[PDB]
Amino acid sequence: RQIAPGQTGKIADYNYKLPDDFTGCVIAWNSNNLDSKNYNYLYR
Amino acid sequence: SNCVADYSVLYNSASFSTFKCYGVSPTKLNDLCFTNVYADSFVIRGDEV
């Protein structure tokens, strides 16, 4: 829910952010079976 | 009142599930100054927040 225009959160200041007037789509899903096992994933 | 408030000590913690601010944006708080803060405290059901 932070992966959207004008939001704030743990990634917003440090990892990834969208323009205030972004023209696009956000497409997301809880795959979990391939995604969870983790040392591949990190934040700043 | 009559004190200095470092709101970054609050806002930098991920322990808060929400920090929704309705007439100031939380990154601006450390540059503002106020007369009274009025902290109200209570417990409710999580889906009611």
UniProtKB/Swiss-Prot annotation, chain B:
This is Spike protein S1. The lineage of its organism: Viruses, Riboviria, Orthornavirae, Pisuviricota, Pisoniviricetes. Attaches the virion to the cell membrane by interacting with host receptor, initiating the infection. The major receptor is host ACE2. When S2/S2' has been cleaved, binding to the receptor triggers direct fusion at the cell membrane. When S2/S2' has not been cleaved, binding to the receptor results in internalization of the virus by endocytosis using host TFRC and GRM2 and leading to fusion of the virion membrane with the host endosomal membrane. Alternatively, may use NRP1/NRP2 and integrin as entry receptors. Residues 45-47 are annotated as: Integrin-binding motif. The chain holds residues 359 to 407 of 1273 of the full protein. Binds to host ACE2. RBD also interacts with the N-linked glycan on 'Asn-90' of ACE2. Cleavage of S generates a polybasic C-terminal sequence on S1 that binds to host Neuropilin-1 (NRP1) and Neuropilin-2 (NRP2) receptors. Interacts with host integrin alpha-5/beta-1 (ITGA5:ITGB1) and with ACE2 in complex with integrin alpha-5/beta-1 (ITGA5:ITGB1). May interact via cytoplasmic c-terminus with M protein. May interact (via N-terminus) with host bilirubin and biliverdin, thereby preventing antibody binding to the SARS-CoV-2 spike NTD via an allosteric mechanism. It comes from Severe acute respiratory syndrome coronavirus 2 (2019-nCoV).
